[PDB]
């Protein structure tokens, strides 16, 4: 649903 | 009395931030890394912004303080997929913050 954040 | 209430909120905010063991919620979500964040999240929140709001007299009752903690969590659940450490960290933050907010509210409602 969103771009997302980079895996931590 | 404003001054002792602000002292209580500062203490409470430090207690909540201590639960952020991943250092995930301590500063705004960086738009340089998450360019679409504002397309989805109407009112970003984080612990640094809460500290600024506190000193700017934006929290004059416990409810408005708790509301912004709850936004840290709900924004994260909304933005991130369930499988991510971000989402899971927000679930944990809510769980751990509960006791902190419960105790602090009782202290506020003694004033």
UniProtKB/Swiss-Prot annotation, chain B:
Q: How does it assemble?
A: Component of some HBO1 complex composed of KAT7/HBO1, MEAF6, ING5, and BRPF1. Component of the MOZ/MORF complex composed at least of ING5, KAT6A, KAT6B, MEAF6 and one of BRPF1, BRD1/BRPF2 and BRPF3. Interacts (via PHD-type zinc finger domains) with unmethylated histone H3 at 'Lys-4' (H3K4me0). Interacts with trimethylated 'Lys-36' of histone H3 (H3K36me3). Interacts with ING5; interaction directs BRPF1 to H4K4me3-enriched chromatin at the 5' of active genes. Interacts with KAT7.
Please state the pathology the record ties to this protein: Intellectual developmental disorder with dysmorphic facies and ptosis: An autosomal dominant neurodevelopmental disorder characterized by delayed psychomotor development, intellectual disability, delayed language, and facial dysmorphisms, most notably ptosis. Additional features may include poor growth, hypotonia, and seizures.
Q: Where in the cell is it found?
A: Nucleus; Chromosome; Cytoplasm
What job does the chain carry out? Scaffold subunit of various histone acetyltransferase (HAT) complexes, such as the MOZ/MORF and HBO1 complexes, which have a histone H3 acetyltransferase activity. Plays a key role in HBO1 complex by directing KAT7/HBO1 specificity towards histone H3 'Lys-14' acetylation (H3K14ac). Some HAT complexes preferentially mediate histone H3 'Lys-23' (H3K23ac) acetylation. Positively regulates the transcription of RUNX1 and RUNX2.
Name of the featured protein: Peregrin
User: What residues does the Bromo domain cover?
Assistant: 1-104
Q: Which organism is it from?
A: Homo sapiens
Q: In which tissues is it expressed?
A: High levels in testis.
Modified after translation how?
A: Acetylated by KAT6A.
């Amino acid at each position: 649903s969103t771009g997302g954040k980079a895996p931590r | 009395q404003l001054t002792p209430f602000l002292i209580l909120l500062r203490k409470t905010l430090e207690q909540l931030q201590e639960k952020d063991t991943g250092n995930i919620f301590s500063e705004p979500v960086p738009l340089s890394e998450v360019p679409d964040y504002l397309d989805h999240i109407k009112k970003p929140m984080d612990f640094f912004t809460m500290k600024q709001n506190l000193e700017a007299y934006r929290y004059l009752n416990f409810d408005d303080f708790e509301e912004d903690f709850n936004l840290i969590v709900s924004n994260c659940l909304k933005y991130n997929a369930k499988d991510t450490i971000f989402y899971r960290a927000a679930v944990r933050l809510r769980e751990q913050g509960g006791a902190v907010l419960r105790q602090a509210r009782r202290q506020a409602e003694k004033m």
